[PDB]
Design a binder for this molecule. Sequence first.
Ligand SMILES: O=C(Nc1cccc(-c2nnn[nH]2)c1)c1cc(-c2nnn[nH]2)cc(C(F)(F)F)c1
Ligand SMILES: O=C(Nc1cccc(-c2nnn[nH]2)c1)c1cc(-c2nnn[nH]2)cc(C(F)(F)F)c1
Length: 263
Amino acid sequence: QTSAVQQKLAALEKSSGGRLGVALIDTADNTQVLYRGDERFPMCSTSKVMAAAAVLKQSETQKQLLNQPVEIKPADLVNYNPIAEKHVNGTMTLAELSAAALQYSDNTAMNKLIAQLGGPGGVTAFARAIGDETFRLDRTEPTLNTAIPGDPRDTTTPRAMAQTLRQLTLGHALGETQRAQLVTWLKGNTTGAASIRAGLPTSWTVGDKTGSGDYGTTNDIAVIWPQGRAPLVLVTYFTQPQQNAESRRDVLASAARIIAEGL
Ligand SMILES: O=C(Nc1cccc(-c2nnn[nH]2)c1)c1cc(-c2nnn[nH]2)cc(C(F)(F)F)c1
Ligand SMILES: O=C(Nc1cccc(-c2nnn[nH]2)c1)c1cc(-c2nnn[nH]2)cc(C(F)(F)F)c1
């Protein structure tokens, strides 16, 4: 069946000229609302959540791991390094790298998390260990953001990402202290106010991770604490056929607004 919310999302998509993917889980009842929920989309920097969570998982058996230093050499800097460039020829701890990756979207910090896991396949292996059979990370930064239509690399589906984000932030994929740390990091994101957040009532609390890339790819994944309701998880993925299209965070906001009104 096509619901009223799905029809509105289809109209939004048609007007946008791109391809939109949405998955909502409402923990009030565990019901899901999906739009293209089983289609693959490039994750771009939303994949930073999985990498940071995988390192948090390692920290459950190594109480000092998040204090472990990692060398930042000049050759490690990639194309967006607002935090890591201040540490070149020095070090950052795994906690600092995780915070920089999640809250500033630092691509050098992401590459250090990937390396701590043994490469992109180490992130995919963690995803599988927590029940996500869909996610795949194939490349490091920055090339994981090429977002080429039809390319399977570095993709997931909205449904799979919403389920995993639920398990990570509200469920028991991580130990209690690690889950609290991930939620703290997401709630302190600096990049999210024009994306899902912009479509929701201002009284609600949001933790989110954005992403963007070529093909005008514009993404956001969020855990939401509404007013007077149990938490939600919402994934909004958008990509465009025109390679040099500008990103459209407003489309993500519009999709979130449609979802919120249909609750
Ligand atoms: O730094 C960014 N991107 C980037 C980095 C390096 C090269 C190119 C490039 N290559 N070719 N054209 N641009 C683009 C970037 C973009 C967005 C965005 N844009 N739109 N919606 N979100 C948001 C953020 C952040 F971190 F603040 F969340 C960063
Ligand atoms: O690295 C990129 N982007 C980036 C970097 C850091 C944070 C965020 C972000 N975080 N949150 N939202 N965006 C986004 C990036 C962007 C483009 C692009 N954009 N437009 N045209 N080409 C192309 C590439 C590449 F290498 F694959 F070709 C990479």
